[PDB]
């Protein structure tokens, strides 16, 4: 049960018990997992009396390529358990690449526990700093409308959907969040771009009780408002006659909205009057929700450039930065949210995993062995190494963070990172230049509509005979199918090399499938990744999916705003 003083006290005690909680976290992880085959090769049995020393001296550090076959083994029809253990209810992918190709990570209910708790504690601390009304609501441009099933009959999933479609998400989050404005079905509509239009609409719908504007990122908040700049008049049109724009075609969301609409002409006068009064839309969020105490999101590192466009949208509204972590592991929580983003730092929560840090203190890089969490050094930069229930044991994520200070006995971390970058040679290509060029060539057919393509991705489906390619696209608006089918043909025709030619013309590699996705999918990928526990170097989103990338993969299927098999060929 969410309360303020008790959780923060427990949190304080816990953070002073940081070393103990961490070591015990190791113990619970392994007592849970004495059986991992990865461990047999390391020599583990557990218990004993030199356990942490044993794990640190016996278990080798690992990369995405090495972990790839094993979790891959878990996903593809070999529903079997390996790096952690149990066949997991979902699987991930990781930003940056694994030799240009995809990386999988296990999901278990523990991560959900970590989820409710970090949100619970952080909400208590922020509600401490930005006290809300207990009967209001909030603008969450949150989505999780998609779920794919791995080729093995196993669910593979993004952080979001796994959270939101989880059996415990609603009851658990009921107490620590102001109620969502959108029906869950709108949140899970098969059309999140139309649903985003709906989200803007729903949040805007209960403004007086609305306590905060939420997106995990500045990128999302910014995208939402530049979009509002585009569509406010349309929004007036849809809301007024009690009839939504013909732009929305999916019957579930449309049905829900119809459950939500009756003709109301006066208010239009209002919105048009205020919306024309602003100066280049500076300070819109306080305008829409005049009593919001804050704009909530990840504002540091690579999100820093979008904080200003957002700041412009947010005006003088205080900007509060969100915490640090992911399905690959939770790291830190901001417990002093009132700090501005440039100076914002997030403190680590100790039972979400067992963490180690490699210092960059030698030159570039440097052969120093990992030192303990509270043994880390003030003002210096280290790379986060993770051990948790996510198939990650002493895993090198590849990101650098700096310790600004300490909250009691637990450290305060800072992120000036962007990309976990060095690259390697791929196979989900079709040179990255070829693929980018592909979307570029097909997308201008969209550009004929004043729409620009904001993002894209792909997938290789080999459960099918013959196997086929799937191209994923994020665009600025709802459009007609004929142009989209044409696009799929262009992507196909953009793979200019002689090889692809040989295949699809031969049909031994099946017709490429353009399953067009909705707004916020790639925003979802970005939003997960930067928050991911390590350090902001989490933004080179992998472009095409070999059956070993899952974050994009869950967000693959359900919002097929449309999905097709080429009528050409």
């Amino acid at each position: 049960t969410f309360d303020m003083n008790r959780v923060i006290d427990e949190f304080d005690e816990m953070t002073r018990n940081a070393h103990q909680v961490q070591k015990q976290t190791l113990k619970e992880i392994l007592l849970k997992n004495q059986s991992a085959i990865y461990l047999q090769n390391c020599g583990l049995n557990g218990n004993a009396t030199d356990p942490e020393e044993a794990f640190k001296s016996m278990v080798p550090l690992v990369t995405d390529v090495e972990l790839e076959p094993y979790i891959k083994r878990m996903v593809d029809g070999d529903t079997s358990p390996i790096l952690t253990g149990h066949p997991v209810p979902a699987i991930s992918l990781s930003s940056g690449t694994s030799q240009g190709r995809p990386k999988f990570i296990p999901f278990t209910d523990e991560l959900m526990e970590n989820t409710l708790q970090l949100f619970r504690t952080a909400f208590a601390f922020r509600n401490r700093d930005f006290p809300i009304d207990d009967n209001g609501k909030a603008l969450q441009f949150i989505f999780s409308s998609k779920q794919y099933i791995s080729t093995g009959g196993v669910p593979v999933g993004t952080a979001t959907t796994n959270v939101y479609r989880n059996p415990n998400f609603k009851a658990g989050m009921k107490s620590i969040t102001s109620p969502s404005c959108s029906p869950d079905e709108v949140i899970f509509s098969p059309d999140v771009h139309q649903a985003l239009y709906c989200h803007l609409l729903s949040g805007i719908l209960f403004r007086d009780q609305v306590q905060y504007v939420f997106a995990v990122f500045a990128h999302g908040l910014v995208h939402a408002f530049r979009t509002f700049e585009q569509v406010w008049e349309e929004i007036v049109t849809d809301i007024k006659d009690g009839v939504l724009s013909n732009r929305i075609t999916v019957p579930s969301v449309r049905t829900a909205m119809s459950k939500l609409l009756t003709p109301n002409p006066e208010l239009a006068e209002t919105i048009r009057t205020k919306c024309m009064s602003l100066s280049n839309w500076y300070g819109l969020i306080p305008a829409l929700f005049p009593n919001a105490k804050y704009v909530y999101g990840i504002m540091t590192g690579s999100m820093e450039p979008y904080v200003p466009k957002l700041r412009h949208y947010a005006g003088d509204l205080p900007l509060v930065s969100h915490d640090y972590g992911s399905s690959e592991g939770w790291i830190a929580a901001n417990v002093t949210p009132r700090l501005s983003p440039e100076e914002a730092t997030f403190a680590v929560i100790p039972n979400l995993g067992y963490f180690e840090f490699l210092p960059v203190s030698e030159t570039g890089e440097g052969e120093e062995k990992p030192v303990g969490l509270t043994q880390v050094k003030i003002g210096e930069e280290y790379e986060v190494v993770i051990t948790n229930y996510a198939g990650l044991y002493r895993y090198r994520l590849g990101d650098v963070v700096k310790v600004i200070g300490f909250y009691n006995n637990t450290p305060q971390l800072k992120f000036i990172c962007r990309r976990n970058l060095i690259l390697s040679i791929n196979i989900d290509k079709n040179t990255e230049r070829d693929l980018q060029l592909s979307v570029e060539s097909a997308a201008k057919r969209l550009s004929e509509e004043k729409i620009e393509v904001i993002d894209f991705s792909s997938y290789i489906d080999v459960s099918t005979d013959p196997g086929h390619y799937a191209i994923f696209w994020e665009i600025s608006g709802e459009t007609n199918e004929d142009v989209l089918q044409d696009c799929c043909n262009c992507l196909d025709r953009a793979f200019i090399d002689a090889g692809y030619v040989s295949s699809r013309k031969c049909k031994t590699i099946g017709a490429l499938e353009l399953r067009v996705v909705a707004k916020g999918t790639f925003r979802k990928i970005q939003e997960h990744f930067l928050g991911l526990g390590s350090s902001a170097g989490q933004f080179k989103m992998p472009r095409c999916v070999k059956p070993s990338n899952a974050k994009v993969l869950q967000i693959l299927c359900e919002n097929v705003v449309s999905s097709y098999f080429s009528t050409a060929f």
């Binding site: 060029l437 004929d482 050409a568």
Partner: protein, 214 residues
Amino acid sequence: LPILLDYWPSMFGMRARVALREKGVEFEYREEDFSNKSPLLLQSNPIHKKIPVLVHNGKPVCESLNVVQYVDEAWPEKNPFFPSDPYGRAQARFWADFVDKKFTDAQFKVWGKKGEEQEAGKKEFIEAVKILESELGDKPYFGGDSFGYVDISLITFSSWFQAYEKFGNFSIESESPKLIAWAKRCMEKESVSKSLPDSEKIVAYAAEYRKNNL
């Protein structure tokens, strides 16, 4: 500075703009109110009073295909649209004539007229896109191994494809896809990616034309 007398939805004006931009010229565009054909235009073509009109050396150059080959001959050092051989040139011109006749009239029928006229125009454009699809065969373009003369000539029709798809209530891609397909391929050239207006607007123009004449 080359001065072009152009019309926003002119597939022909587009032939001119695409041709010049394809080549590498910096030029000026002037939109025309055909209700008030401008004084330089009334002197460019005092009888046809039609565009596109490129003016060079104070000499009016008229007709779209004429204008594009004008484009070729005006700067013969970098981007040629024809191949080296006379026969290849003959093939390209041949196909140019092709785009200009049954194809243009058939589309004109599909988005400008309805009913009895409409169906005839519809089987006409599907037939044209078919022969078209056959001759495209495999080439990235049409008039040479790279971006060609005719490439310029029929690419500009591909922003109206949307209008044809809707009033026609068809889908010209399932019957002949490699064509529109080749079209959004051809959109990646900066020549047409900046010369051609939006299709929703073009559709709307077709819609205005239709609303005016029922």
